[PDB]
Design a protein around this ligand. Structure first.
Ligand SMILES: [Ca+2]
Ligand SMILES: [Ca+2]
Ligand SMILES: [Ca+2]
Ligand SMILES: [Ca+2]
Ligand SMILES: [Ca+2]
Ligand SMILES: [Ca+2]
Ligand SMILES: [Ca+2]
Ligand SMILES: [Ca+2]
Ligand SMILES: [K+]
Ligand SMILES: [K+]
Ligand SMILES: [K+]
Ligand SMILES: [K+]
Lengths: 361, 146, 361, 361, 361, 146, 146, 146
C-alpha cells in the first residue's frame, strides 16, 4: 500500500533526525566541561563569573538534551504502534521498556550545577604510605560520569547504517528473518574491517583514560608525577600492555579503577589484534599455486644433481681401487666418505619432495 | 507519504533482484533461485502458495504493484495472521489441517499455563460450530476479524 | 521388577537428603568463624565469653557434620551393595575407598577449638627488609583451612543435577555406556554456559582470596596498606591479570601463597575467557548468506562503474588527440593518467570479486 | 643371517650398559658438589681437610666418567662400522663426529679442583645503587656449569626406550623408512602424555634454578632477601608466570641470567599447558550424542508449551471483548501483551532448535 | 622482440647496481656516527679536530647517498615509461609518487653537521622525583633518527630476490597475474623459514634498542644504572617479555619511547614464536602410522590379558565356593574384589581401543 | 517399596521415546532408529537377540511391563552374566562358541596372572562335561547359578 | 641491446616448462595441463585463441621465436589493447560482440563520471559510422592504432 | 649368542604380524595388507619382486628362515646395492632399465660436481662392454662385486 509504506518512511526519517541533535548537545556539554575543568585550576577560581556562565551553558544544554530524548522515545513508541497493528499506546509499555528510559534520563541528567561546594578528601600516598588531606570541590565528582554520554554515537551509527536504511537490504533480510539490531551491525563491521575498529577504540580509550587519570590525580600530587599528561599517557600504555606500573602507582582510587579497566580491556584487545595480524600474513590461492610450482621445479633440479653426484663418487671409487696399480688409501677413504654424504643428501631431498607433494593435497 | 519518486526507485532496484529477465514478472523459478542462494530448498508446493498469497489476478504473476503488497507484510515485525498459523501446525499433523476436539481439550489443559475446564468447554462449543468433531483450525480467520 | 526399582529409588532420595544438611552445617560454621575473626580484633578480646560461646557453636556444628558424613557414607555403601548383587558389605571396602573417607574426616575436623593459646610470629617487612616480631593466637592457623569445606557444593550440584535424576536420561545413557560422574556434569556445564561458570568462579575466588590476604596481613601491617580490604581487592585483581605488584607486596608467606595461587588460576582463566569472547563475536548461519548477497551486489555495481570510467577516458583521449585541431598536451596527459587509474581500479575490483566468490565457495 | 643379527644385538647391549655408569658417576659428582657447597659456608672453611677429601672424590669420579665416555664412543664407532659394511674405522671421522666428542669431553671435564684460590668480586646493589665488594672463592665459578651433565638422562631414556629396543618396532619402521633418533621419542612422549613431561620439567627447573640463584646471591646479600631458599622459590615462580619482580631484584648477573632463562621457558610452557588443558575439557562422541538427544527432547517440549500459550492468549482476548458484555480494557491490554510475549518466546525457541539441528551434523 | 627484451633487462641490472651503493654509503655513515658518539664522551671533546673530520666524512657520504637516490629514481621512471608504452615522462608524475621521493630525501638528509651547538636539558629522576638539569649537545638529536636508513636493506633484498630475477618465475606469475611487490617476498620468506626471520629481527632490534637507550641515558645518569650496556640489554630483554621494569625505569622520554616500542613488538613476536614452536612439535604421516600400528598391537595384548584374568578369577571363586568343604570367606571376598577389578580393567581397555580406532578413522 | 504413581510417569515418558507410533509396542525398526542416532549401526541379527532376551511372551515385541525389566539390568553398574560373556568372545573364533581345551589350557597358563597346571587340570575336568573336546563356554550360566 | 647468450638460456629453460616432451612445439594440451596446476580450467575455445594470438605461421603451434613474443606482452604491467577489451565484455551480452547504440547512451550518461549529451552524440556518430545500429566494439583497435 | 632363544622369540612374534593365517607362510596379499595400513598402495608388480628378492626356494612364499634374511638388509642404515640402483632410476623413466651413452655423457659433465672428459671416456669405455650403445646399468652389481 502506498500510504502504509510512505508513513513508515516518514517516521524513520523523523527518528533519524532527532538522533543527531542529541549527539551534538551531548558533545557540546562534554567539551565545555573539559574546558571549564582545565581553566578552573590556574586561570580563575571557583568564585568568579566565568565558571557561573559555563555551568549555566552546561545546564541549558542538558535540559535541551533531555527534551530531545523524550521526543525521540515518543516517536519510537509511535513507530512500534504502527509496526504491530496496535491502536493503543498503553500496550507498548512494559517493565523492560520503562526501565531503560529512566536509565537514560538518569545517565544524561548528571552534570556540574552552578554554585560553590567543597568537601574533605583524604588519601594514602604510594611508596611512602604517608597521609594526605585536602579540600576539594564537588564538581569533580559530577563531571567524570559525563563520559557515559558516548552511547549516542552507537545509536547514530546504527540509524545511519547502509544496511539499516536500504530497501533491498530489508527486503532480502525479511525473507531470511534477520533481526536488524545494533549487534548485527557491530558483527558486520568486525567481519569487514576489524583493525580499523580496534585502532579507533584503542586511541579513544587511551586519550580519555589518560585525561581522567590526570584529573583525579591533580589534587594529591605535589611532585609532577601522575598529574603530568605525558606520564599519564605512558602509564596507560604500559598498563594496557600489562608490563607493570614502574613508579607511577596512583595515590587515588579513581586512578586505580581506571588502571583496572584499562588492563581488563587490554587483556582481550591484545589477543584480537594478534589474531588479526596473524591472519593478515597468509598467502592467497594463486600465490600458493605459483610458489608450489617453483618449489617443485627447484626440488626436481636438486634431486637430479644429487643422483648424478652419487654415480660420480661410485665411479671414482671403482677407478681408484682397481684401475690404478698402487692404491692410495687416503683417496679411496675420502671418496667413500663423499659417497655416503651424497647418499644422505639424495634421500633427504627425496623426503622433502615427497613431503611437499603430500602437503600440496 | 505517497511514495515519492526516489522511494519508488529504491523498490525498483529491489524488484530487479528477483526479476533477472527484466520482462516485468517474477516466476516460481526466479523466486526459488534467490531462496536457494540464502540456504533454503523449498519445494514447488511451498513456492506456489507464496505467489497466490499476494497474486490478485490469479495468473501466477507478481508485478510491481503486487510486489509492494508483499513487502508491507514482510517488513512488519509481527503478523497476527502468520503467527497463529505456526501455532496450530505444531500440533497439526497429516498435512490436512484438521484437529479433533479430543486433542484440543487435552493440550489446552495440560500444556502451558493451562486453561480451565469450563473455559475450554465454552471454547470448544464456539470452535466446534459445525459439530462434526473435526475442527479445521481455520477458525482464526473469523476470530481475529472481530 | 517393581520392588527392585522402588528400593533403588528410595536410596537415591535418602542419599540426596543427607547432602543438604552437610552443606548447611558447613556454611554455618564458616560464617560463624568469619564473624568471630572479625569481632575478636576490636570489639572484644580472646579472654571474654563471646569467643567461648561462638567456638562452642562451631564445635557442635562440626560434630553434627561428621555424624552426617558417616551416615551418608553408610547409605552409599548400601547403594553399592544393591547395585552389584553383593550380599556382604566387606566386599566394598578397598584401599582407595577407605583413604577418601579418612581424608574427608580430616578435612572436616579442623576448626578453632575453645581456649586461649598464643605463639610467636616473626616476619621480614617488604621493600625495607626490617624485622618484625609479634605474639599471635593459634586460632588463625586453624580457621584458614576451614575453606576446604567448599567441596560439598559440587556434591550437592551433582546429586541435584537434572541429568543425574531423570529416568529418560539414565535409560538413554545405559544404551551408550556413559558414566554419570562429576566430570561429565562439569563438562556439560562448560559446553552449555561457560561464561556464567567463569564469572561465578572468578568472583567467589576474588572475594575469598582478598579476605584471606587481609586476615593474614593484619598482624604485621601497622600502616594500613595490605590490611585494607579495598587494597586487598585491587592487589588480587592486578595479580590475577598479571600486571604486577606495585607497592603491595605482602610481608607474610600466607599472602605470597595466595598471590601465587591467584596468578596460577588467572593464567588459564584469561585464555578461556578470551576464547569464549572470540567465539561469541562471529556471525551465524543465515547471516553470512545475507551479507554475501549485498557484497556481491555492491561489487557488481562498482565493476560496472569502473568499466564505464575506462571507456569514457579512452573516448576523451581519442577526441582530444585527433578531432580537435590544436593539441593541448596537459589535457591529454591528465586523461592518460586518469585512464591508467581507472584500469587499476577495474582490476582491483575484479580481484576483490574473485576473492569473495572463492571465499563463498 | 643368524650370526650377523647376533653380533649386532651384542653391541646394542654393550652400548646400553655403558650409559648407566656414566649417569651414575655424573649424578654422584653433582650431589657431592652440592653437599660441599652447602657445608663449606658455615660448618668448615676452605682450608680444612673435608673440602680436600670431597674435591678428591669429585676428581676421581670425573676421571672415571671421562674414561666411560671414551669407551662408549669407541663402541658406537664399532657399531657404525658394522652397520655400513665398512672395514676401516677412518671412514667414520667426518669433521662433525670429532667436534661433538670434544664438546662432550669439555662439558664433562669442568669441576672444582682441590686447592685454595680466591678472587675479588664487585657488585651494584638493587634499589639503592650502592657498591659492594668482597673476596670470593673460584670454586663457585667451576661448580655452577656442572649442571650441564644432565644431557645423559636423555641418552639413557633413548637407549632404554621400548620403541628403540623392540624387534617388531624396528621391523615395522624399516618398511616405512623411519629414523629412530632422539627427536622421534620426544615427540612420541609429547603426543602420548604431555602433561607429565611438562610437570616434571617445570618442577626440576624450579628447584635447580632456585638453588643456583641462592648460591650466586649468598656473597652480596647481607639482609636475608635473595639468599633465602623460600624467597628464591617465590621469585622463580613469579618470574616464570611473568607477574613481576617485586622487591626481589638480584644484585648479581647470575640472578639476572637465571631469571631471563626462566622467563623465556615460561613464555612457551604457559601456552603449551593452557592448550593441553583446553583440549582435556572437551566431550567425546557418545556423550556428545547423548547430550544432543536430551537437548532435542527439551527443545521439543518447550516449543509445544509456547505453542499452547499462544492459542490460550488468543481465545481470551476474543472472549473478553465479544462474548463478554462490558469491556475491561485493562484485561484485554494485558492479554495482548502476553500474546506478543508468547509469540516472541515461540520464535526464540524455534530458532534455538533450528540452530541445534544445523550444528549437529 | 629481441631488442625490447634486451632493453628491459639492461634497466633491471642498472637499477640493481645503484641499490648496493646506497646501502654501502648509508651503513658507512651509521658506523662513523656510532664511533664518533662513543669517542666524543671520554676520549676527546666537541671542540677538537677529530669531531670535525668525522662529521665532514658523514656529510660527504650523505651528499653521495642523495645523488645515488636521485639517479635511482630517474632509472625507475625510465622503467615505468618502457613498461606502459608511454612516450612522455610527465605522465608518470602523480601526487603519490612525488610524496615518497620527498619523504626519502628528508629521511636520508638528517645527520650531525659540523660545528659546536648546545642546549639545556631538564629531566625528572625515577623513584626519587628529583629535578636534574644539564647542558647537552644538539648532535644527539640529529644522530638518533639516522637509524631510519635501514629501509634500504629491504630494497636490496627485493632486487636480489631469486623470484624477482628468474625468467620462469616471472613467466608463471604473468600467466597467473601475480604482482611481484615487496609484500609477496616477505610472505614467501615467512612461509618458508619464519624462525630465522624472527631470530634475526629480534637480535638486531635488541642490540640497536639497547644502544639507543644507553645513548639517551648517558646525560642524566650519575650512578651507572641505565647507562650500563649490560643493564640496558637486560632491561630491553625483560620489557620484550613483559615481565616488568624492576628498578631500571629510565629518567628520559627516550627510554620510555624505546621501551614502549619494544613491548609493542614483543606482544606479537612472542605469539608468532610460540605458534611456530607448537607447529614444529607435531608428527608426520609415516610416524603417525607407525605409532598407531604399535599402539594397536599393545592394546590387543592388554585386552587379551584382562580377558584371561577375568576367567581366572571366576574359576577361583567357583572352586573356593563349592569344591572345598570348609569355606574360608576371606579368600572368597578377596577373589570377588579381584573379579570386579578385572572387569573394570577390561572395560577400560576396551574403551581405550575404541577411542583409538575412532581417532584413527 | 513398590513404584509410586509419579515414578511410573517418568518411566512411561521414557517408554514413549522408543514408542514413536504410540501403539504400545516396540518393534525392531523402532529400536534400531534410536541407536542409529546415537552413533551405532547394529545389524538385524544383533537387534533380534535384544528383544527376545527380555521378551517373555515370545511374540518379538517389547511392551511396558517388559520394558521395566530391561531397564533394571541396564542400570546396574556391573552385570556378572554379561561380563563373563564378553571375556569369552575375546578368545571365541568363527562365531560358534565351542573352543577346544587346547587353547583353553594355553591361555590360562601363559596369559594374565596364569594358573597352576594342577588348577587348570581340575578346571578342564569340570569344564569338559560334554567330553567331545569342543568346550562350549555356556557353562558360565551354571557356574554362577551354583 | 639484443639478447645475450645467457639470457636465451633463461628463456629456453622456461620454454621446457610447457614443452614437456622436448620437440620444439607447444600443443594445446601442453598449455592446458600447466594452467590446470595453477587452479584454472579453461575450455578448448579459450585455449585456441591463445595460440593463434601469437602464432604467425598459422599452424596452431607455438615455437621458440613465437614464445618470446608472447612473453613480451605478458611482462607489461598494463596492455592498452587488452584492458579496453575487458571493459567492453562487462556490458557485452550473448557473446556476439555487438552492443546496440541504445545501451551506449545509457551507460555513458548514468554510470561513472558520466558524459554530457553532446559528447556521447559525437561519440556515437564516430563509433557508429556504418549506421546499421549494431555497434561492434572492434572499433577500439582502430582508436589506439591511429 | 647368535641363536639365543629370547631373540628368536622376539623375531617370531614380529613374524606373526604379517602371518595372519598362522600356518607359517607369508603370501603376497598378506604383505600388501600390512603395507596398506602404513599409507602405501603398491601394485602387484611392485610387491612381487619383494618376495623373490629374498626367496631362495623359488616357491613365492616367505618362511621364517627367509624372513630373518630380509630383516638383516632392512636394519642397515645404508645399503650400497639399493642406493646405487635408486640413483639410476632418476634418469631411467622408460622402465626397461637402459640408458644410452649420449645421455650418460651429458649428465656426468654438466650435473653435479661434474667429471672431466678424459675420465668419462674411460668410464664409458668400461661401461659399454656390449658396444651396442644401449648401456644397461647392470654394471653396478659388477662394480661392487669386484
Ligand atoms: Ca521474469
Ligand atoms: Ca498477477
Ligand atoms: Ca511401535
Ligand atoms: Ca513380548
Ligand atoms: Ca611438445
Ligand atoms: Ca607456429
Ligand atoms: Ca599365511
Ligand atoms: Ca621361499
Ligand atoms: K605480563
Ligand atoms: K601475557
Ligand atoms: K607483568
Ligand atoms: K612489575
Amino acid at each position: 500500500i502506498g500510504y502504509k509504506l510512505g508513513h513508515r518512511r516518514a517516521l524513520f526519517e523523523k527518528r533519524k533526525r532527532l538522533s543527531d541533535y542529541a549527539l551534538i548537545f551531548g558533545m557540546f556539554g562534554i567539551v565545555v566541561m573539559v574546558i571549564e575543568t582545565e581553566l578552573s585550576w590556574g586561570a580563575y577560581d571557583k568564585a568568579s563569573l566565568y565558571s557561573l556562565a559555563l555551568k549555566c551553558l552546561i545546564s541549558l544544554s542538558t535540559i535541551i538534551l533531555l527534551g530531545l530524548i523524550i521526543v525521540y522515545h515518543a516517536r519510537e513508541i509511535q513507530l512500534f504502534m504502527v509496526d504491530n497493528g496496535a491502536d493503543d499506546w498503553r500496550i507498548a509499555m512494559t517493565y523492560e521498556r520503562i526501565f531503560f528510559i529512566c536509565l537514560e534520563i538518569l545517565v544524561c541528567a548528571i552534570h556540574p550545577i552552578p554554585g560553590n561546594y567543597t568537601f574533605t578528601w583524604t588519601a594514602r600516598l604510594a611508596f611512602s604510605y604517608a597521609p594526605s588531606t585536602t579540600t576539594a570541590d564537588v564538581d569533580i565528582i559530577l563531571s567524570i560520569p559525563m563520559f557515559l554520554r558516548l552511547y549516542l554515537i552507537a545509536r547514530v551509527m546504527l540509524l545511519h547504517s547502509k544496511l539499516f536504511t536500504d530497501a533491498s537490504s530489508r527486503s532480502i533480510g525479511a525473507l531470511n528473518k534477520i533481526n536488524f539490531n545494533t549487534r548485527f551491525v557491530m558483527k558486520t563491521l568486525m567481519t569487514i574491517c576489524p583493525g580499523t575498529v580496534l585502532l579507533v577504540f584503542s586511541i579513544s580509550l587511551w586519550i580519555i583514560a589518560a585525561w581522567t587519570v590526570r584529573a583525579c590525580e591533580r589534587y594529591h600530587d605535589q611532585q609532577d608525577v601522575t598529574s603530568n599528561f605525558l606520564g599519564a599517557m605512558w602509564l596507560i600504555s604500559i598498563t594496557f600492555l600489562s608490563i607493570g606500573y614502574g613508579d607511577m602507582v596512583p595515590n587515588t582510587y579513581c586512578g586505580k579503577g581506571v588502571c583496572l579497566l584499562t588492563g581488563i580491556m587490554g587483556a582481550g584487545c591484545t589477543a584480537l589484534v594478534v589474531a588479526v595480524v596473524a591472519r593478515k600474513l597468509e598467502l592467497t590461492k594463486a600465490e600458493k599455486h605459483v610458489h608450489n610450482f617453483m618449489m617443485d621445479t627447484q626440488l626436481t633440479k636438486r634431486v637430479k644433481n644429487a643422483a648424478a653426484n652419487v654415480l660420480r663418487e661410485t665411479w671414482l671409487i671403482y677407478k681408484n681401487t682397481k684401475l690404478v696399480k698402487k692404491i692410495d688409501h687416503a683417496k679411496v677413504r675420502k671418496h667413500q666418505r663423499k659417497f655416503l654424504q651424497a647418499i644422505h643428501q639424495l634421500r633427504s631431498v627425496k623426503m622433502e619432495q615427497r613431503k611437499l607433494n603430500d602437503q600440496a593435497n | 507519504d505517497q511514495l515519492t519518486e526516489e522511494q519508488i526507485a529504491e523498490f525498483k532496484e529491489a524488484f530487479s533482484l528477483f526479476d533477472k529477465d527484466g520482462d516485468g514478472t517474477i516466476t516460481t523459478k526466479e523466486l526459488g533461485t534467490v531462496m536457494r542462494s540464502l540456504g533454503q530448498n523449498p519445494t514447488e508446493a511451498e513456492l506456489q502458495d507464496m505467489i497466490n498469497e499476494v497474486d490478485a489476478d490469479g495468473n501466477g504473476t507478481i508485478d510491481f504493484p503486487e510486489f509492494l503488497t508483499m513487502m508491507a507484510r514482510k517488513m512488519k515485525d509481527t503478523d497476527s495472521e502468520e503467527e497463529i498459523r505456526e501455532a496450530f501446525r505444531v500440533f497439526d499433523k497429516d498435512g490436512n489441517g484438521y484437529i479433533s476436539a479430543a486433542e484440543l481439550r487435552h493440550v489446552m489443559t495440560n500444556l502451558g499455563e493451562k486453561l480451565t475446564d469450563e473455559e475450554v468447554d465454552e471454547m470448544i462449543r464456539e470452535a466446534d460450530i459445525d459439530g462434526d468433531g473435526q475442527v479445521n483450525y481455520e477458525e482464526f480467520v473469523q476470530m481475529m476479524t472481530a
